[PDB]
Ligand SMILES: [Mg+2]
């Protein structure tokens with residue numbers, strides 16, 4: 145009853161629908177996806193602006209000594225005739241009659257009225273931004289579907305847009321279920337108790353996705369309270385519910401029965417390593433009516449994060465309006481021998497480093513293994529930035545064979 | 559008087575010193591660098607825990623029918639003898655006398671007291687996490703110098719650390735100087751006015767670096783107010799001052815004279831394209847005494863962001879305690895013909911996409927040019943995630959030659 149991972153997210157990509165757009169402020173638009181076309185209301189520059197510090201001249205007059213008629217520093221709104229020059233700084237408006245601008249280190253100084261000598265001859269239009277040189281009027285400078293970075297903020301500011309129409313981020317509710325879970329603030333542990341590490345992990349994992357987290361806390365293994373928390377969640381306005389634990393084969397695992405009771409489950413077992421259990425349900429809020437997506441993530445720590453990175457991250461990007469929600473996939477060569485599982489494809493976590501020499505004798509990517517891949521050993525996720533997509537061959541891949549990998553974190557490194 | 563870029567940041571890397579560590583909360587520790595060693599106070603698991611849902615058995619008894627003595631679900635703290643089995647779920651404590659755990663789909667059901675039939679024979683220690691299986695007691699699970707991601711949050715929660723010793727982020731003050739600058743909220747522009755796009759750009763650029771921004775606003779081209787803003791900045795507790803504009807050859811550019819007056823300037827002209835002007839000064843606060851770093855970024859929009867990505871981002875990472883503050887550098891092949899400047903090396907911005915086939919017939923990176931590289935055309939920074947490091951050869955590199963590139967944004971893409 146296991147669904148392949150390719151079909152698994154094919155279902156999610158078919159059920160998840162992009163969120164309605166919202167108006168936000170300029171800084172609130174950082175990282176979000178543009179939901180409208182931006183047109184510049186005036187050109188840039190809206191006036192002939194000097195590119196270099198120096199003097200606005202007539203190209204015909206050529207080199208020689210000339211008087212400085214007026215001055216036109218960046219700030220103010222007189223013409224120049226053949227035989228006179230005007231002093232300008234960068235950004236300054238060019239007066240009428242000027243054909244070009246000579247630099248200042250291409251001029252000489254030369255106590256009443258001042259005169260300046262021009263050492264070179266300039267072709268017409270030298271060091272001058274014509275009106276609309278960089279941005280023309282009413283032109284599209286940012287288009288729908290673009291992700292707002294720092295430069296796109298600078299373009300919005302150039303055009304005067306401080307209120308932007310964007311697709312918002314999904315609100316995410318997160319909870320843990322386990323009768324053995326205690327808060328991480330707990331000091332000495334009692335018999336059969338462990339601290340709750342999946343919740344704080346998912347909270348931070350969603351925080352990195354710039355989504356609003358709503359911390360529903362620890363829930364015990366009982367149907368009544370687990371239902372109360374679920375009914376609280378969907379009615380609070382959340383878009384995605386993230387459940388950790390209570391989705392296995394035990395007789396107190398009420399996540400699958402409660403999801404299929406309140407909505408429509410699409411799968412509960414996935415051909416994965418790790419993370420054989422993975423429940424994905426569609427729930428409907430009953431108020432403004434809206435559809436809520438629910439991920440019953442497995443309770444094992446490394447299994448929880450892995451399912452988050454492969455099935456929740458694209459779901460978040462798709463609700464936020466990304467055109468390419470899928471993660472970056474790269475081909476790399478192995479740095480050490482590693483065996484694969486024969487039954488299900490193993491998402492082996494590795495540390496990816498770019499090298500100016502590998503894959504053969506060319507520059508490419510390499511990846512060393514993090515160690516043991518136990519579903520409970522969270523030390524395998526430590527400093528892991530890649531996810532090796534290993535086939536279910538059961539063989540041993542040599543320290544040089546090429547495989548496929550998913551980028552789950554920014555490499556940076558050296 | 560131009561300093562090469564390699565020597566330029568060699569100075570910055572020599573002047574910038576890592577910040578003193580601060581205690582923060584668990585969620586406040588996301589993204590920051592660990593300034594202490596974390597040791598687990600108890601092992602994980604602190605008790606023998608069942609890996610699979612099923613029954614704890616004696617390996618010697620083998621297959622057959624057996625009674626279910628007690629039940630041990632995840633939660634509670636009776637022994638089992640050869641001939642009896644105990645029902646356990648995942649996470650449950652294993653009673654005394656059990657050697658292994660059989661799965662539940664490897665058992666049969668079989669109305670008074672219940673009996674269960676074991677279909678298979680298990681080797682000793684099957685599906686059982688011994689005490690400390692994943693994390694041993696007093697072991698280092700996170701070490702100094704590590705960047706706290708989502709999984710490192712999960713490890714901190716496992717160990718009970720909710721107050722962490724980390725290196726903080728630098729506080730960054732940002733300001734613009736220009737007598738032609740108006741706020742981006744301005745509607746119809748007057749004669750000689752442009753909206754201030756560098757400030758909002760730098761604010762967002764620093765926001766992406768998870769640093770605290772202090773918006774000092776627009777400052778006119780005059781020495782008195784520009785000094786008042788600088789004296790306000792260093793006295794407010796800031797660690798880095800980011801200035802935009804007023805650092806060129808004009809006669810109202812007071813950033814260089816005021817920086818060298820209040821501190822020690824290390825360079826003012828850099829062999830760069832774009833961004834020939836780039837002033838870096840060291841200022842000292844006069845109170846707890848502290849040293850402030852000042853970047854006089856050039857006023858041209860694309861020139862401002864480029865200097866930010868190459869000289870400010872590593873300075874931020876070094877103050878925050880990174881061991882590899884330098885950006886990721888990758889070798890890629892060109893997708894189109896492009897000419898280089900003969901005098902200074904040009905940092906040409908490109909759109910980098912990973913392809914399963916290029917550089918030859920192998921998988922690698924490719925990069926297409928963004929278009930015109932004018933220092934004032936901010937449309938060249940649009941959707942640019944890479945920075946081509948072009949040599950000062952002045953030749954034309956064919957649509958297939960390999961060059962060096964700096965990753966300034968997460969590729970993602972397809
Ligand atoms: Mg459980």
Ligand SMILES: [Mg+2]
Pocket residue numbers: 218233234235735736803804808857
């Ligand atoms: Mg200026």
